[PDB]
Ligand binder design. Structure first.
Ligand SMILES: Nc1ncnc2c1ncn2[C@@H]1O[C@H](COP(=O)(O)OP(=O)(O)O)[C@@H](O)[C@H]1O
Ligand SMILES: Nc1ncnc2c1ncn2[C@@H]1O[C@H](COP(=O)(O)OP(=O)(O)O)[C@@H](O)[C@H]1O
Ligand SMILES: Nc1ncnc2c1ncn2[C@@H]1O[C@H](COP(=O)(O)OP(=O)(O)O)[C@@H](O)[C@H]1O
Ligand SMILES: [Mg+2]
Ligand SMILES: [Mg+2]
Ligand SMILES: [Mg+2]
Ligand SMILES: [Zn+2]
Lengths: 614, 47, 359, 384, 97, 142
């Protein structure tokens, strides 16, 4: 029967939902969607814990401290408003600043039980999504009547109830036999996941701590193993810890699950674009020095190397791939290789690409070997089946892979990369498993000269020492050297000393600067690094240029000319060069946001290739 | 819960002050009840 | 380790160290306290004084990360006492680990990843480079170590991180350590007729990584022998136990825990940024340095064994700031640059023992 | 009658970054023995629940498992065995022939986006059709199926041809050198979850029985893997003598292979066999061996570039006076062709004898000077 | 760190070097060691303490011990026409200790 | 020393030295429990201040009958024609939002690996701690 306290807690949350009206229209929107569009959306909204502090302090403190008394009231209050604006229950989500309830699996203790918490870590394993039976319907052929029953369990209501163990009906109240109507019963899905502390926040050489999260219905398939995640929910004690006859059974009943992005991880980074942002992105295009402004802002601290600055942007945007009715796939990724002297900032260039790209994985020479790049087979304890867990290149699909110290790899891995750089498929034929996986990735790499330093007397085949088959699979092979000089020594020295003296905004000189780990959230003046990602993200999703009848003649001339010319080149010439020219041409048209490839872009591609060749 | 609560149009702290004021104010047309109580003090009244 | 450390200071100790900083000639007291039982090796010791303080860490808005730490190599004959210097640097530094190439008995040299016996999930089992974060790792016998370890050591020494990529886990780790390496020369001893490059049993591009290269030569001379023998024989008598415990109590020597605390303090207190009136001095020095190498190397055909690169300019840059810090200063005058270049010539420009630099 | 099948996702349906998932199918009645491993199908079924089979400690509520009850099976590539000549197969094979020129028409209908290489595609079509198998007497057999090998310099489209020929065949498998090693080729020992029996799981060679096998990067394989290919191409059986196994597998498969020269490019200064890694005895078993070199020619390059750049602009082939036969119609004509057994007379025998005499006389002078991949043998006569 | 067959427990065990602290260690057939044993010997003789990082245990142990060792030359017999370093398979870093 | 332990030292205080090799995960144990009967709805409480054993348990029978407390309570306990209120064999449910908990840990101490008998496996002991002693040490410490 009605409780006064429940009623007042509902009333105050009705007033809260009335004062800040940004949540009512959000509820309106989902009904508008599910009616006008008949992908049915789930019945949920998100609340800010910062708004609650301003509106009411005690109600805020109560959800932080006593969720099991203030959450069902708020949910019922929300359901009432939903049924009000209406011409299936509803549930809430939580965001804002939590404070002392922003914990990790190691610092989460028994004094935080029965409160709402935020937990950080890595997802290590997910289970199979299973149906759960709620209501079952039956039929009696001797009376022409249908009967039903309801089932419930302890992980669906935040407060403790008196158990009702009902049974599965096979028989009528007179004895008539009942047929089970599987299509008329209701089933709701279930999944369980385990979380662990992230490897770069955990103490070195110490065993890790983990926590179990239970998800149901709509939150059931949001993540995969090996992800950075933030979860919010109630830390619940269950059952009796052996007092009917280790301790109590503890787990989190999830309500919010946020994917997070980190360096060298399989979760991509995306940002929400404001119309103001779009206006600047589109304004920048018309000025006909877009390429130079964007190129010089690519790690401006390294000096020169402007053509590699161009090439990295061309790889970051990339062309277009094409599928024919036949069933043929034609590649559209660009790959870069760099050979130079042992103090030419190769690793700074690689690390910058790792920091800026939306999805990137870092590998160093012999570091990754064999299965570590392609895939490996494991066994599942429960079902007993043999499964696959992804290697580096399977994870970096529609992305970039950074290979530092490229020349240190064995031939066995080289033959495996031959298949990824051209067909972009990985084929596995192990005991019982025969499957093909997708790996559509671009590759950037850096290599050391065989003789320590580049020898101008000898020809390239004696300095590089890589097979022609692998060389042809790289679109661009750049060579760089540091010529000892005085003019450039002065110029470089002065600039490098400029850089080494820089105050971050807001410190008195002397004060040490402070380091923090950057965890993201997923959904001629130089341009800011945070804006370059916004530019690229729009430039890939929106523009898909088509080929014109003009520039084909330029490409044809350049390819024919190169193949019937007799200068010693830094790479062999094949049909791969023919396709490379088109990929390069379409990348520049992605830079310009035009719907068609053009002649100026074709000549920029040709100029770049010829500089990198001769 | 298993013991539900209800709301009634009463308040005991509110009426206790009214009881006190009546017992330390009433002078019928020294104060009446406070003279009854002064006789109570000296063991000269039982009810 | 990097978690169980004290980062708050008592007022009396703070006043003690602010009065010790104003000590008129403290440079010489410290240099006296870093291995006072070693005879000679003063240039080596000042290098370690600057080493334990490290350069100024700088994080730039381009995503790029310019490191501050100091790398020193001790190459030379046997029995020069360079091993004891590492064993002392172990004990005078708040975070330290003493390892040999090829790791240790059952401890590795680079991050190792294994699957938990109980849960069967991925955790970091160990690795000296991540265990000694924020400290010093003395790599003895640098000459013999495996290629898989060398490749990771390179990225740890430059970008101060390590990258892991296997079937299950991908991640980038933080390894912010200082390197002090000691290697013996091949052929028993160092032949002066042969370039330093072929006097080492490994590739010559490894040398460009370091900042100061110290070549110690065991030269035979009777007068030095008498003095060193007398030094050793008094230490075994007991004299140095009462010539240290005595002048220790006369402000001509700091102690081992006091020094340790002091280094922790200055490390976690200040960050020197150079004076612009001094920058062009360091810039002109670098060009005059490299001009001579170009002249000599164009005179002949073979290239130099010890190359002067862009990494060695930032060596000067860092060592100026390392000396600027035990002064608790935010800026460094020209005297820091003067001492820095003095020590640089003492350490790195012993490329004068190299064939196409003699001229 | 009961059977239980596992079905897995296609590559083009898996989201970005995830692994493909699986499902269970049940079959009863006269619908058994209709699905075989390695098929792409569309199955009609009724989706029904089953009792839970997981861990008790992880049970929350009335959880259930799912399975599918089969009612009707469709296969995207119809097998050649099923061929029964009805009246609509008559209609379209009767139009195919009325336009004549069938050999060239169906030779250019293999990968119409790859320029040139007509002679390679003519050989490919014959490897798709096959020959005649002869039980000579005493129960001894001659193989009647052709094996083709391709060599060439980088960037000549060999792998695209292998992919295409694996898409056209009803049974056909594509494998790469080191990713399919050991038990991934021959067979493995596993215990059956359903029947509780010890079975042998087939590899690539066992999945392509009565089909075409496509191997890429032939030169990189292990010696153990090469021995099995040797045996399959000679007698079409695989013998295994390891712990727990003494059997002989029946493998009727045709081999298509691709390989690069040892030094990347072909060195005409070096001998023909100095440029190929494989032993000459293996290359003596392939019926036809094609060498696809890349000698720069100014004129031909503008016709190749035209085709490729046209293809990247239009998703169709550039020829308007040629009809590309659909794969289904090609499969029908190939099946009807495979239902015939022609025979040889004496006059045709004379010709073959006479040609063999002259070829055997000429091969020796070439092999003496070290300018041939192989001296003529009886196997060349069998190939002819 | 291994498992005890009897009690079914995980144990920390040191080598003979650790177990013989303030005593003597006797290594027979000193020239046939594998890389692991050689690294352990070098650490013990140089620094006189054993380091381990396994299964969540990070520690340093005391190895103040005396070493006596026996070895056979290369080939089988002694070559007097060459120095010591060229008759035996041990290296100068170890011999000098 | 760890090997000098005998029957004498049982229920007595000892001082010991060693090295840590194991540390388990923190477990939850109750300090204050609130319960209810699933048949009659009687409520009570439990307080625990002795966590050293590794014990209090839940009552086996309803306490409403033995606490014949109210004059109408012993009357609500009757009825249903002729029979005696029988709640059941064990009818107490824990109301978790109204209960409080603490942390408990397990550790293993090992003798110094140096002063060990030659050729024998080192011996170890199992230790229990709670409240303000948890997470104070790591394996590898003496
Ligand atoms: N052209 C350059 N401009 C600016 N700094 C440079 C340049 N080349 C090298 N450096 C600096 O010198 C060091 C080069 O180290 P590293 O990245 O390891 O070189 P490499 O990868 O070529 O071996 C870094 O401090 C880098 O910032
Ligand atoms: N100059 C010196 N002053 C004091 N002790 C010295 C000196 N030179 C050598 N010794 C002593 O002699 C030994 C030298 O060997 P060691 O320190 O291992 O040197 P190395 O690094 O060359 O192997 C040590 O025990 C050291 O204490
Ligand atoms: N003659 C050709 N016609 C059309 N495309 C070709 C031709 N030669 C090469 N290509 C293209 O160039 C690439 C060659 O890749 P691949 O088939 O692996 O060559 P290879 O087998 O020699 O290594 C493919 O994209 C292919 O479409
Ligand atoms: Mg490098
Ligand atoms: Mg030494
Ligand atoms: Mg190929
Ligand atoms: Zn009861």
């Amino acid at each position: 029967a009605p409780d006064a306290v429940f009623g007042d807690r509902v009333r105050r949350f009705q007033e809260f939902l009335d004062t800040f009206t940004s949540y009512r229209d959000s509820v309106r929107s989902i009904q508008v969607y599910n009616s006008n569009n008949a992908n049915i959306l789930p019945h949920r909204i998100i609340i800010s814990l910062d708004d609650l502090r301003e509106f009411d302090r005690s109600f805020w403190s109560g959800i932080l401290v006593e969720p099991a008394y203030f959450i069902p009231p708020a949910e019922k209050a929300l359901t009432d408003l939903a049924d009000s604006m209406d011409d299936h229950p509803w549930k809430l989500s939580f965001k804002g600043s939590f404070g002392a309830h922003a914990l990790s699996p190691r610092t989460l203790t028994a004094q935080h039980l029965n409160k709402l918490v935020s937990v950080e870590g890595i997802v290590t394993k997910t289970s199979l999504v299973r149906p759960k039976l709620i209501r079952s319907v039956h039929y009696a052929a001797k009376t022409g009547r249908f009967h039903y029953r309801d089932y419930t369990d302890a992980t669906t209501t935040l407060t403790t109830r008196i158990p009702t163990p009902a049974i599965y009906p096979t028989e009528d109240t007179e004895g008539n036999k009942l047929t089970t109507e599987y299509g008329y019963s209701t089933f709701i899905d279930h999944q369980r996941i385990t979380v662990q502390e992230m490897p770069e926040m955990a103490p070195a050489g110490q065993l890790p701590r983990s926590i179990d999260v239970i998800l149901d219905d709509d939150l059931v398939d949001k993540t995969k193993p090996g992800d950075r995640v933030n979860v919010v929910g109630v830390f619940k004690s269950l059952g009796a810890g052996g007092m009917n006859q280790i301790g109590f059974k503890t787990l989190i009943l999830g309500n919010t699950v946020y994917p997070l992005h980190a360096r060298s991880t399989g979760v991509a980074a995306r940002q929400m674009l404001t119309d103001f942002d779009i206006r600047n992105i589109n304004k920048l295009s018309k000025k006909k020095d877009i390429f130079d402004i964007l190129s010089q802002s690519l790690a401006p601290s390294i000096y020169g190397h402007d053509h590699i600055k161009k090439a990295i942007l061309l790889m970051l945007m990339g062309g277009v791939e094409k599928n024919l009715e036949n069933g043929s796939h034609l590649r559209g990724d660009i790959n870069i290789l760099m050979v130079g002297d042992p103090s030419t900032a190769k690793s700074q260039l690689l690390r910058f690409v790792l920091n800026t790209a939306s999805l990137a994985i870092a590998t160093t020479g012999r570091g990754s070997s064999g299965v570590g790049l392609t895939a490996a087979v494991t066994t599942d304890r429960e079902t007993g089946e043999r499964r696959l867990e992804a290697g580096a290149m399977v994870l970096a699909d529609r992305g970039v892979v950074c290979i530092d110290e490229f020349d240190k790899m064995t031939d066995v891995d080289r033959v495996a990369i031959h298949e990824v750089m051209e067909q972009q498929t990985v084929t596995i034929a192990k005991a019982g498993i025969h499957t093909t996986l997708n790996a559509r990735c671009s590759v950037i790499a850096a290599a050391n000269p065989v003789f320590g330093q580049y020898d101008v007397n000898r020809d390239p085949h004696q300095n590089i020492a890589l097979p022609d088959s692998l060389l042809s699979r790289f679109d661009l092979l750049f060579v760089v050297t540091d010529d000892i000089n005085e003019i450039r020594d002065r110029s470089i020295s002065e600039h490098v000393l400029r850089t080494h003296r820089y105050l971050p905004p807001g410190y008195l000189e002397g004060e040490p600067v402070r380091e923090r780990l950057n965890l993201s959230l997923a959904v001629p003046k130089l341009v800011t690094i945070p804006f370059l990602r916004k530019y690229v993200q729009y430039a890939k999703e929106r523009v898909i240029p088509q080929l014109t009848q003009e520039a084909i003649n330029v490409i044809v001339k350049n390819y024919t000319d190169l193949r019937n010319d007799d200068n010693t080149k830094k790479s062999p010439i094949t049909a791969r060069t023919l396709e490379t020219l088109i990929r390069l041409a379409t990348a520049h048209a992605k830079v310009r946001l035009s719907k068609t490839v053009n002649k100026v872009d074709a000549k920029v591609a040709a100029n770049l290739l010829r500089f990198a060749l001769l | 819960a298993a013991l539900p609560s209800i709301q009634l149009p009463v308040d005991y702290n509110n009426l206790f002050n009214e009881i006190t004021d009546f017992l330390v104010t009433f002078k019928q047309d020294g104060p009446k009840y406070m003279a009854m109580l002064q006789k109570v003090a000296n063991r000269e009244l039982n009810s | 380790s990097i978690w169980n450390s004290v980062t708050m200071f008592t007022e009396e100790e703070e006043e003690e160290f602010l009065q010790l900083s104003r000590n008129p000639k403290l440079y010489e007291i410290l240099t006296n306290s870093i291995a006072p039982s070693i005879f000679g090796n003063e240039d080596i010791k000042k290098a370690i004084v600057c080493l334990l303080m490290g350069g100024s860490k700088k994080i730039l808005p381009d995503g790029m990360r310019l490191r501050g730490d100091i790398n020193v190599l001790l190459l030379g004959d046997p029995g020069t006492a360079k091993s004891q210097l590492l064993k002392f640097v172990e004990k005078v530094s708040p975070i330290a680990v003493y390892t040999s190439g090829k790791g240790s008995s059952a401890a590795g040299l680079t991050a190792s990843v294994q699957r938990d016996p109980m849960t069967r999930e991925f955790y970091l089992e160990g690795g000296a480079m991540v265990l000694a974060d924020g400290g010093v790792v003395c790599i003895d016998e640098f000459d013999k170590m495996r290629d898989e370890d060398r490749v990771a050591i390179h990225e740890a020494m430059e970008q101060q991180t390590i990258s892991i990529a296997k079937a299950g886990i991908t991640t980038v780790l933080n390894s912010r350590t200082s390197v002090l390496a000691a290697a013996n020369p091949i052929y028993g001893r160092y032949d002066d007729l042969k370039s330093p490059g072929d006097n080492i049993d490994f590739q010559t591009t490894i040398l460009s990584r370091f900042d100061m290269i110290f070549i110690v030569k065991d030269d035979h001379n009777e007068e030095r022998d008498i003095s060193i023998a007398n030094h050793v024989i008094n230490i075994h008598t007991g004299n140095a136990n009462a010539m240290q415990n005595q002048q220790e109590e006369n402000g001509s020597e700091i102690s081992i825990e006091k020094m340790k605390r002091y280094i922790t303090y200055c490390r976690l207190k200040c960050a020197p940024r150079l004076s612009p009136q001094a920058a062009e001095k360091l810039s002109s020095n670098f060009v005059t340095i490299r001009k001579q190498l170009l002249i000599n190397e164009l005179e002949s055909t073979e290239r130099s064994s010890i190359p002067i690169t862009i990494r060695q300019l930032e060596a000067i840059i860092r060592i100026t700031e390392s000396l600027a810090k035990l002064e608790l200063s935010p800026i460094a005058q020209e005297r820091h640059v003067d001492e820095a270049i003095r020590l640089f010539q003492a350490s790195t420009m012993d490329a004068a023992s190299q064939d196409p630099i003699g001229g | 009658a009961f059977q239980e099948c596992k079905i897995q996702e296609l590559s083009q349906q898996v989201p970005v970054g995830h692994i493909p998932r699986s499902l269970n199918i049940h079959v009863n009645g006269t619908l058994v023995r209709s699905l075989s491993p390695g098929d792409i199908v569309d199955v009609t079924g009724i989706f029904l629940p089953a009792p839970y089979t997981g861990f008790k400690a992880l049970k929350a509520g009335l959880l259930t498992e799912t399975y599918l009850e089969a009612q009707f099976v469709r296969q995207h590539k119809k097998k050649f065995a099923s061929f029964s000549l009805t009246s609509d197969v008559e209609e379209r094979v009767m139009e195919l022939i009325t336009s004549g020129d069938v050999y060239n028409r169906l030779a250019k209908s293999i990968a119409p986006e790859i320029y040139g290489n007509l002679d390679v595609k003519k050989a490919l079509l014959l490897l798709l059709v096959g020959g005649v198998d002869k039980r000579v007497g005493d129960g001894m057999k001659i193989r009647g199926d052709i094996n083709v090998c391709l060599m060439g310099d980088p960037g000549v489209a060999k792998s695209q041809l292998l992919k295409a020929i694996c898409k056209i065949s009803p049974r056909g498998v594509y494998t790469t050198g080191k990713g399919s090693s050991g038990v991934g080729l021959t067979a493995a020992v596993m215990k059956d979850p359903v029947t509780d029996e010890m079975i042998l799981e087939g590899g690539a060679l066992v999945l392509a029985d009565n089909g075409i096998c496509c191997i890429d990067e032939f030169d990189k394989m292990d010696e153990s893997d090469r021995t099995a290919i040797h045996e399959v191409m000679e007698q079409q059986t695989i013998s295994i003598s390891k712990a727990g196994i003494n059997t002989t597998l029946n493998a009727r498969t045709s081999i298509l292979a691709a390989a690069n020269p040892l030094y990347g490019r072909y060195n005409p200064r070096l001998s023909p066999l100095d440029n190929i890694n494989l032993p000459a005895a293996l290359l003596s078993r392939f019926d036809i061996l094609f060498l696809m070199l890349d000698i720069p020619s100014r004129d031909d390059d503008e016709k190749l570039a035209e085709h490729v750049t046209y293809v990247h602009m239009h998703n169709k082939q550039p020829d308007l006076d040629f009809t590309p036969v659909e794969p289904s119609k090609m499969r029908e004509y190939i099946a009807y062709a495979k239902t015939k057994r022609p025979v040889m007379s004496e006059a045709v025998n004379d010709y073959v004898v006479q040609a063999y005499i002259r070829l055997r006389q000429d091969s020796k002078r070439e092999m003496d000077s070290k300018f041939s991949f192989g001296q003529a043998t009886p196997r060349t006569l069998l190939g002819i | 760190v291994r498992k005890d067959p009897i009690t079914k427990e995980w144990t920390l065990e040191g080598g003979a070097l650790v177990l013989a602290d303030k005593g003597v260690c006797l290594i027979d057939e000193f020239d046939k060691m594998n890389d692991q044993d050689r690294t352990s010997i070098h650490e013990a003789m140089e620094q006189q303490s054993i380091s381990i990082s396994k299964a969540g245990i990070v520690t340093t142990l005391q190895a103040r011990c005396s070493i006596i060792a026996a070895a056979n030359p290369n080939g089988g017999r002694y070559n007097s026409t060459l120095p010591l370093a060229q008759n035996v398979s041990l290296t100068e870093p170890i011999l000098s200790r | 020393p760890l090997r000098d332990l005998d029957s004498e030292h049982v229920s007595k205080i000892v001082r010991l030295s060693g090295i840590i090799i194991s540390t388990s995960v923190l477990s939850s144990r109750a300090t204050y429990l609130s319960i209810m009967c699933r048949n009659c709805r009687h409520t009570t409480s439990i307080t625990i201040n002795n966590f050293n054993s590794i014990t209090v348990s839940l009552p086996r029978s309803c306490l409403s009958t033995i606490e014949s407390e109210s004059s109408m309570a012993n009357e609500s306990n009757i009825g249903d024609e002729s029979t005696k209120k029988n709640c059941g064999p064990d009818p107490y449910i824990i109301i978790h939002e109204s209960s409080k908990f603490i942390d408990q840990q397990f550790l293993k101490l090992q003798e110094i690996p140096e002063l060990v008998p030659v050729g024998e496996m080192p011996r170890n002991l199992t230790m229990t701690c709670d409240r303000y002693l948890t997470n104070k040490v790591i394996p590898g410490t003496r």
